[PDB]
Amino acid sequence: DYTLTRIDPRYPLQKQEIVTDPLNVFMGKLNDMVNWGRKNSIWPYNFGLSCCYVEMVTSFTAVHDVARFGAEVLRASPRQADLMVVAGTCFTKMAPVIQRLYDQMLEPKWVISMGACANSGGMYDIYSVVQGVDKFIPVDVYIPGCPPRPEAYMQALMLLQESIGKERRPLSWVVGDQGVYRANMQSERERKRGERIAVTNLRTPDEI
Amino acid sequence: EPAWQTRDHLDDPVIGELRNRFGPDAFTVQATRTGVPVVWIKREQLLEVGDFLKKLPKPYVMLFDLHGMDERLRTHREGLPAADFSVFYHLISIDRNRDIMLKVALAENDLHVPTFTKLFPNANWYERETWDLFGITFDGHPNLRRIMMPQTWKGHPLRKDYPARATEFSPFELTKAKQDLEMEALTFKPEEWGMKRNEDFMFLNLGPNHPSAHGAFRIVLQLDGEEIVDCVPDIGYHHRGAEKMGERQSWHSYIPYTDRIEYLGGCVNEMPYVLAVEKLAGITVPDRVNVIRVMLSELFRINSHLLYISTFIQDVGAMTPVFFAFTDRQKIYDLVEAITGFRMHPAWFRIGGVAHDLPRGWDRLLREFLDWMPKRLASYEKAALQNTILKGRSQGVAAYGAKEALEWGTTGAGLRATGIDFDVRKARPYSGYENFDFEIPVGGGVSDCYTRVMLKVEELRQSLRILEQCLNNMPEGPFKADHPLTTPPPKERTLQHIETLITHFLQVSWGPVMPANESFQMIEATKGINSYYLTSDGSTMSYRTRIRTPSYAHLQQIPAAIRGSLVSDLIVYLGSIDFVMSDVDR
Amino acid sequence: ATIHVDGKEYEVNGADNLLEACLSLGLDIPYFCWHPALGSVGACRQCAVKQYQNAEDTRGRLVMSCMTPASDGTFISIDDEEAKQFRESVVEWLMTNHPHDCPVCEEGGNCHLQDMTVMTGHSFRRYRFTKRTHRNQDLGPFISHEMNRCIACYRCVRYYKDYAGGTDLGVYGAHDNVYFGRPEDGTLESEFSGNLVEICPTGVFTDKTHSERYNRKWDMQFAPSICQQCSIGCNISPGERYGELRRIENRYNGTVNHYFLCDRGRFGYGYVNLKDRPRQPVQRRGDDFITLNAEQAMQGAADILRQSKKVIGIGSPRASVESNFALRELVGEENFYTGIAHGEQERLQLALKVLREGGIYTPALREIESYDAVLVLGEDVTQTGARVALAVRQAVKGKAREMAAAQKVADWQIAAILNIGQRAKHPLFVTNVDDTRLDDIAAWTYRAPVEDQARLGFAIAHALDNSAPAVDGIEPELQSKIDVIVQALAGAKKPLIISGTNAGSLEVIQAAANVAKALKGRGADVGITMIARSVNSMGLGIMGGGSLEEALTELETGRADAVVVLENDLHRHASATRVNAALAKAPLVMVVDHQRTAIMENAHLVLSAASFAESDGTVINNEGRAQRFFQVYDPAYYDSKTVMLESWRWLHSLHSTLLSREVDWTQLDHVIDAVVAKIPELAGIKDAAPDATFRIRGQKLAREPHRYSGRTAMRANISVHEPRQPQDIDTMFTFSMEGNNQPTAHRSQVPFAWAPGWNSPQAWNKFQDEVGGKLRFGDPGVRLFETSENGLDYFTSVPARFQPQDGKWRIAPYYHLFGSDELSQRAPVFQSRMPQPYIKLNPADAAKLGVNAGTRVSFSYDGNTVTLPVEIAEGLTAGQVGLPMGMSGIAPVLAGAHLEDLKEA
Ligand code: SF4
Ligand code: SF4
Ligand code: SF4
Ligand code: SF4
Ligand code: FES
Ligand SMILES: [Ca+2]
């Protein structure tokens, strides 16, 4: 129920294989402590592409307060950032810039596609748009929407936190196994199918 | 006579003046639904006509638009000169409150026009875009390089034989050699951009990743110490191909793409497109539709102005009004979600009306917003806008007069801070804006950053007044016109009448058939003047969709106004323009 | 003639009515009850315009443009307020009883009534009362019936009865309860009943075979193609969705098959969607069937073909010109054998010699309708070349047409034409072994064996011209009928002689050639039409080669140790046991085919070829016109494992791998140029269609409409990433909507008809130069040969009369439009329409054998005893037994053969 990824510099320059979860009880507790610290302090790269970035900085404001999750520092440097939110369209002139900024980020790093443009190109199936940011960089969380509302971005933040909290990474670069192990978690569609199909009645659209 | 009727405008005094000056056989008058006199001028007389219009007793002082059209696939070209391509020039005389559209016909092999930059400096970027997207060469241009697409691009995207969709092309593969080659193309070289370089002129790179809400873009700066001796903006990093999608989507299905032209505008962006399509369809919307569209336009205008003022204050250095202004944006978003069901891109305007009726309880939410807003605005002024540090950062920074605003096509608050009282809602009224009592604020004559910001505050207050008038006087009636081309028809008649079901079936599947004509609508957007110029060839898709945006003009006006200033002055000027890069590139 | 429409002057034809003249000018007038092929009746009252007496007139009067001639100096208005109001009122009256059915209607998005409701501007309903309803009928497996949607425009009855000559469809009832259908539930008996799905402007008659896997018109990927189910070569528009051939529409060709197809072409396409088709190359290794891709298939096939001492190739008339030529280049000209029998090849080459050397013009399918007398010798036209039978019916009604023309009645006023010419008709004389479907309009029918039909033709030619060989032994009654035929044919300005190779007799073709030569020698404008068997029978005959029997002897003698069979099952052209033994003896059998045939069990290699829906190519129809068919869809778009290529691509890659050990596939224009360079008789196929570099102002031609949907969801279950659009390097069409399909585009190949405001098949009016005429820039297709300057000589081989010998039964051929074709029986929707396999017997022969109707009798052919039930055929001559050709187990080469020990089982 895990995937093993090791990188060695077409993009992405990684190869993944399905592997059994390896997990002493002290090493496991240290791994959960490291994962807890990584998931409760996630610093996003302040990267503005399009309208989805306007919704992201709406999520950062007072009526939403994304600071409650410890994800508010909003670094302008990719070295100091933990999370790349592709919040906008992957234009062909901007795609090498996105690749360069993602390369300049440091491990551990995670990617959230925010919006239909970053997911698959969205409505812009046009000559000057890369059809999704997963064509050239690996994505951890996808948010459908055009735009997603700010609480959808927070929901993806919680999904990323839950994905980090059960993934395995080396504690030190001199001791252990240096490959990155990511959990193959259950899809949210199959998890929410029980509560979504049973919905019967909704409020009529003629009211407030 | 309805306002959508086809007119040749032979009663315009400019037509008689051109008859007396150049002769009757020199040009062809075209009857359109654009509302403007369209004159097909021969190519060798184009600069003469431009000089004559610039030297009129009430001169045509502003080049509103300049672009091209591929006429090869156009079947209904009756009463028109023979052409494979054409170049159109939209020129505005503010003193007459009139405008004229010159058109130059071009063959497929001889695709060269004399340049228009000696008369209007905005023709630089307009002709660069026309060369980039249509391949039309302009003789005498200082630098005719691509402005939207990279320099290593093959073909011109807006030609009719160029495939539109990315799925037509190969999927995007990023290899090591491809990444190196595209990173080499984005590198700046002083000689190619016409910098015209002293052993001290350093070069500065601003973008293309941009820590602000208004898009991602580059500015390359030539510096003597800290002084900006020259600069040229690099745009096209936000190009979405929206006009090519206008040729690719039907009339009804293009409205979501019209939403994302200026993504802080929403229904303000939807308004000129649906007005131009209703001109093409011969649809006069009822008064309730006009009041609803005015109300939503003013709501989104207050949203955009709140974001602009908050972003300007944040760029000065005070970071709290962005939190409070986004709370006010959340109140506006509550009302907009209640009415349309979406926050930023409602796509709620329709050909002939709006998608739904107003929900029960809209007046309550509008009342809460109208009670909430003015105290918050006064707190914004007292906390940040009257701060002397903000005034020192803003007043006197990147200032220009009426002549520089007129020659560069600057509209909106930047034009009106020069003292020129020119708002579309009062000069060329649209969508029943003549029934609303509101004032147009103007400046003293100098367009500082602070003057533009205070003007946008004043238009926020006037939009609050318009919203109060909309709340007090909303007519009872239909939310959709009774025209046969109202797309889509009212939903319940579609659900129980077979003829209405047929109309809806054909309008949402194949599209509604607009008769072959040309239409034009310009509106006062949240950031200036936004216009749609729509050419229909009689089909269910647009033959040509031309979207004129003011942010293009303001980004082109940047090097003339920021020259000889500091880099922080450039940051303040960027924060005080009220642009977005989707508006620039689209 | 000069007309003035809305103040604008137009030059039109004064013989036309105002509706077709105004539609030819590009003006839009709504209409329901008028059809270009059917004429004007003035029923629906939808085409109303306002006519003025003179130029200075303001009142005017509402007239009907279909019923008003477009005479010189006419003044009309379409956009007049009263005319617009009346047209909207007519649409409203039609909409009072219409069901709320558009989402669940197969005509939705393809509906003429929808287009005319939108065009008239009627979108508000104020009728508040009830709507009339009708029960539906079961009209068979092909046509679905829904009478609630009818607007009582009488197009169906007019087409089916006046044009198609059918009998079982009619109008019943009264004032507003008019019902259109059969008198009782049952299958529609017309061979052209499938055209009702395009004739009906509503969804009353619908394609049930399409209604099974239904998709809308905007979701279809269309191509211009040629129907492969017989030799006529009707132009079709196959439309595909989700990797299966969904529908066949009539593609307008004003020279061939203008508005109408037959039922075999319209509903016999189901073999393409069979699940047992080969989709990958398969190699047999003992009991193992290894699936390969194309490269290792070519490598292995190249090694086994290079190790062989002599390779032979057996073509087929099913395959295109390019594929047969590629096989001929792979195996050599001397080692290339046509896949047909020796007798079939002899009849086909004689028909070709008559067509391109007899000095007599061969009419096109549309040109057949302008002939003054028709003699059909041997060919059951309705069951083999059905559209020729429809054109024969039109030529027969030409006498009523000219009788009405003699009374100054316009040619579009069809009711007056049919009233004047009540039952008078042009002479039609049909010969067969039994009754035909042309017997209701034939002046005479001769039910006789093929030798007797040939003798009748020879006697007709001798009586027309005494230089022709005479026939001795003609009965006085037969001589009187011959005199009647001769007196009819001699007095005809344009006689037409129709024969073919399906009769199984060389002497029938010789007699038809003699009749045509005798009519030509008298100065008449005689035309001759030969009906071949398969789609590219004429092309295979022009290319030539040995027969199937010679290839079988080459396999059996051991001189050929490798055989490549291209798209041929080989059991329809020879006995199955001999073919199986000869193929089992050969150490290498390679079958290049798109259908799972019976000889693939013995095949060492099977190449998954493409059908007409997945391939481009050229086919030569029965008149010698080369026609290019284009690929409809990429098979590998959905199933990425599917390796299914064109047959000429397979064989050219095989030839390249055999010669130089490298795999080069081809481009299609390279194969076309190779055909033109090597075979000068097939040099006309270059000009059949323009090459792959042809563009309309720089862009390609679109295969699918501009509102094509689902592009980011059609393949989303396989992969969420959108794949590369399929590239078409072979032709000028693209597998996308990013192309040109303008009605004014300078081209001849139209994949589908669509215009803004015209979503129905009435957009072909926008795609024509004048409505009902040709395509605007010429119809596609080019005749391979012109008429020769000098003709043939008289065939002196007059056969002896048919003598019924004891113990031997002459096999009289019976053809069926549903069942005789090789590929159409594979279509699962045909098995309900395919007849049961009987055998026909004379009453005297049945009484001599002591058998009744329905009992089973067994006969042995080539040492194979098979049993069949019996019908009693009254018209069948004694000494003959009637077998249905092309059926399950009955090969078409059995026609004209003899039978032994035919006795009751
Ligand atoms: S998904 Fe929609 S809201 Fe987000 S960047 Fe794209 S167009 Fe803007
Ligand atoms: S026949 Fe036409 S109008 Fe009637 S239900 Fe079908 S699509 Fe609708
Ligand atoms: S069934 Fe169809 S073709 Fe026949 S009268 Fe009714 S609408 Fe016309
Ligand atoms: S007549 Fe022959 S070619 Fe024409 S549709 Fe029928 S089967 Fe096809
Ligand atoms: S088309 Fe003329 S009345 Fe029907
Ligand atoms: Ca192909």
Give CA torsion, residues C474, C477, C481, C487, to 10 deg.
90
Residues 6 or more apart in contact with residue A196 via CB below 8 angstroms: none
What 8-state DSSP symbol labels residue C877?
A: P
Nearest to B543 by CA among B521, B516, B520: B516
Please give the Cα distance from B139 to C609 (Å, whole number). 56
Q: Tell me the CA–centroid distance for residue C31 and ligand 5, in Å.
A: 5
| Size of the B and C interface in Cβ pairs below 8 Å | 106
Please give the Cα distance from C302 to C605 (Å, whole number). 11
Please give the Cα distance from C890 to C814 (Å, whole number). 11
Q: Tell me the CA–centroid distance for residue C201 and ligand 3, in Å.
A: 7
The angle subtended at Cα B398 by Cα B395 and Cα B400, nearest 5°, is: 100
Where helices occur in B408-480 by DSSP H, the ranges are: 413-416, 424-427, 449-472
Kindly state the tokens that stand for C812: 């009289």
Contact C100 B498 (CB under 8 A): yes
Kindly state the tokens that stand for B247: 């040729």
Distance of CA C483 to the CA centre of its chain: 35
User: Resolution reached, in Å?
Assistant: 2.9
Please give the Cα distance from A62 to A71 (Å, whole number). 14
According to DSSP, the β-strands at C282-285 and C288-291 are antiparallel
Please give the Cα distance from C165 to C154 (Å, whole number). 15
Please give the Cα distance from B584 to A93 (Å, whole number). 15
Nearest to B158 by CA among B574, B554, B581, B547: B547
Please give the Cα distance from A85 to A87 (Å, whole number). 5
Kindly state the tokens that stand for B520: 């034009």
Nearest by CB to residue A125, choosing from C712, C720, C721, is C712
Please give the Cα distance from C139 to C590 (Å, whole number). 44
As to burial, measured by CB atoms within 10 angstroms (0-12 exposed, 13-18 middle, 19+ buried), residue C569 is: buried
Residues of B in contact with A96 (CB under 8 A): 174, 179, 182-183, 186
B111 in a domain, yes or no? yes
- Strand-pairing partners, residue C50, are C62, C77
- How many CB atoms sit inside 10 A of residue C101's CB? 16
Q: Do the Cβ atoms of B520 and B530 come closer than 8 Å?
A: no
Please give the Cα distance from B135 to B429 (Å, whole number). 36
Distance of CA C813 to the CA centre of its chain: 21
Q: Give the residue numbers spanning the domain of B120.
A: 13-139
Best to test chain A binding among C709, C722, C724, C738 (most A CBs inside 10 Å):
C722
Q: In one letter, which amino acid is C61?
A: R
Nearest to A23 by CA among A145, A188, A171: A171
Q: Does C722 touch chain A (CB under 8 A)?
A: yes
Taking the CA of residue C385 as reference, the ligand 4 atom at the shortest distance is 1
Kindly state the tokens that stand for B235: 């745009």
The reply to whether ligand 4 has any atom less than 6 angstroms from the CB of C386 is yes
Q: In one letter, which amino acid is C778?
A: G
- Collapse the DSSP code of C105 into the 3-class scheme (helix H, G, I; strand E, B; otherwise coil) and give the result: coil
Q: Do the Cβ atoms of C733 and B536 come closer than 8 Å?
A: no
Tokens 């191509």 found at: C223
For residue C651, the surrounding DSSP H or E stretch is helix C647-660
Q: Does B215 touch chain A (CB under 8 A)?
A: yes
Q: In one letter, which amino acid is B18?
A: L
Q: In one letter, which amino acid is A90?
A: C
Q: Do the Cβ atoms of A131 and B172 come closer than 8 Å?
A: yes
* Domain of residue B22, CATH code: 3.30.460.80
Q: Do the Cβ atoms of C19 and C34 come closer than 8 Å?
A: yes
Secondary-structure percent of chain C, ordered helix, strand, coil, rounded to 5 = 30, 20, 50
Kindly state the tokens that stand for C315: 């073509």
Please give the Cα distance from B462 to B438 (Å, whole number). 6
- How many CB atoms sit inside 10 A of residue C723's CB? 15
CATH 3.40.50.2300 for domain C808-904: no
Q: In one letter, which amino acid is B208?
A: P
Q: Do the Cβ atoms of C437 and C453 come closer than 8 Å?
A: no
Please give the Cα distance from C89 to C77 (Å, whole number). 17
Mind giving me the DSSP string for B147-174?
Answer: SSS-TT--S-TTSTTS---TTTSPP---
Please give the Cα distance from C617 to C323 (Å, whole number). 8
Q: Do the Cβ atoms of C896 and C505 come closer than 8 Å?
A: yes
Nearest protein Cα to ligand 3, atom 4? C156
Please give the Cα distance from C654 to C330 (Å, whole number). 7
Q: Do the Cβ atoms of C848 and C835 come closer than 8 Å?
A: no
Please give the Cα distance from B145 to B131 (Å, whole number). 8
Please give the Cα distance from C65 to C50 (Å, whole number). 9
Pocket of ligand 2, beta carbon within 6 A: B 502; C 98, 101-102, 105, 107-108, 111, 113-114, 149, 202-203
Domain boundary among B139, B156, B185: B139
Kindly state the tokens that stand for C890: 């009955």
- Collapse the DSSP code of C89 into the 3-class scheme (helix H, G, I; strand E, B; otherwise coil) and give the result: helix
Q: Does B145 touch chain C (CB under 8 A)?
A: no
Q: Do the Cβ atoms of C571 and C329 come closer than 8 Å?
A: no
Contact A63 B343 (CB under 8 A): no
Where helices occur in C42-129 by DSSP H, the ranges are: 81-94, 112-119
Kindly state the tokens that stand for C93: 């009256």
Residues of A in contact with C712 (CB under 8 A): 120, 125
The reply to whether ligand 1 has any atom less than 6 angstroms from the CB of A122 is yes
Kindly state the tokens that stand for B226: 């800290």
Give the dihedral sign, CA C681/C683/C687/C691: positive
Domain boundary among B115, B139, B163: B139
Residues 6 or more apart in contact with residue C313 via CB below 8 angstroms: C327, C328, C330, C331, C335, C336, C337, C563, C564, C565, C566
Kindly state the tokens that stand for B352: 């002939």
Contact C711 A125 (CB under 8 A): yes
Q: In one letter, which amino acid is C276?
A: D
Give the dihedral sign, CA A32/A34/A37/A43: negative
B187 in a domain, yes or no? no
| Whole-Å CA distances, C538 to C531, C610, C672 | 10, 21, 17
Give CA torsion, residues C654, C659, C661, C662, to 10 deg.
-70
Sheet holding C373-377, edge to edge: C444-447, C428-432, C373-377, C495-500, C527-531
* Domain of residue B563, CATH code: 1.10.645.10
Backbone phi, then psi, for C324, in 5-degree steps? -65, -40
Nearest by CB to residue B237, choosing from A63, A94, A205, is A94
Nearest by CB to residue A208, choosing from B173, B338, B357, is B338
Q: Do the Cβ atoms of C233 and C622 come closer than 8 Å?
A: yes
Estimate the crossing angle of helix C321-331 against helix C668-678, to 10 degrees: 70
Mind giving me the DSSP string for chain A?
Answer: -EEEEEE----S-EEEEEE-----HHHHHHHHHHHHHHHS---EE--B-SHHHHHHHHHTSTTT-GGGGT----BSSGGG-SEEEEES--BTTTHHHHHHHHHHS-SS-EEEEESHHHHH-TT--STTB-S-GGGTS--SEEE--SSPPHHHHHHHHHHHHHHHTT-B--S-SSSS--SEEEE-PPPHHHHHHHHHHT------TTB-
Side-chain-side CA neighbours of C862 within 13 Å: the count stands at 13
Q: In one letter, which amino acid is B347?
A: A
Kindly state the tokens that stand for C314: 């057996």
Q: Do the Cβ atoms of B582 and A117 come closer than 8 Å?
A: no
Evaluate the omega torsion of the peptide bond into residue A147 and state whether it is cis, within 30 degrees of 0. Answer: yes
Q: Tell me the CA–centroid distance for residue C67 and ligand 5, in Å.
A: 7
Tokens 């193609």 found at: C225
Residues of A in contact with C720 (CB under 8 A): 120
| Whole-Å CA distances, C691 to B437, C615, C669, C670 | 66, 15, 6, 10
| Residues B304 and B433 both lie in one domain | yes
Breaks (C–N over 2.5 Å) after residues, chain B: 197
CATH code for residues A2-198: 3.40.50.12280
Side-chain-side CA neighbours of C205 within 13 Å: the count stands at 25
Q: Does C125 touch chain B (CB under 8 A)?
A: yes
Contact B238 A92 (CB under 8 A): no
Please give the Cα distance from A71 to A164 (Å, whole number). 14
Backbone phi, then psi, for C606, in 5-degree steps? -120, 120
Best to test chain C binding among B161, B162, B486, B536 (most C CBs inside 10 Å):
B161
B172 in a domain, yes or no? no
As to burial, measured by CB atoms within 10 angstroms (0-12 exposed, 13-18 middle, 19+ buried), residue C249 is: buried
Domain boundary among B139, B154, B170: B139
Q: Could you give the number of structural domains in chain B?
A: 2
- Collapse the DSSP code of C161 into the 3-class scheme (helix H, G, I; strand E, B; otherwise coil) and give the result: helix
Kindly state the tokens that stand for C239: 């439309």
